[PDB]
Ligand binder design. Structure first.
Ligand SMILES: [Zn+2]
Ligand SMILES: [Zn+2]
Lengths: 60, 8
């Protein structure tokens, strides 16, 4: 899913760039995951990115 | 999707 950010509680906008979990495919903004830039997001994606529940369950 | 996304 994309058209809701459960981290922000759904005040969705297209202006902030996004990243997704490799397992769940759910999208979230860079800022609600403390990622600074599009390049930091590309680095985080190349590292094999994870959503909020995937931190305890399957991190990296 | 492609891990990263930006509109536009
Ligand atoms: Zn968010
Ligand atoms: Zn996940």
């Amino acid at each position: 899913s994309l058209v809701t950010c459960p981290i922000c509680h759904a005040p969705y906008v297209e202006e902030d760039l996004l990243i997704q979990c490799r397992h769940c495919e759910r999208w979230m903004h860079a800022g609600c995951e403390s990622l600074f830039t599009e390049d930091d997001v590309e680095q985080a994606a190349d590292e094999g990115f994870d959503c909020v529940s995937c931190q305890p369950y399957v991190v990296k | 999707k492609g891990g990263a996304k930006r509109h536009r």
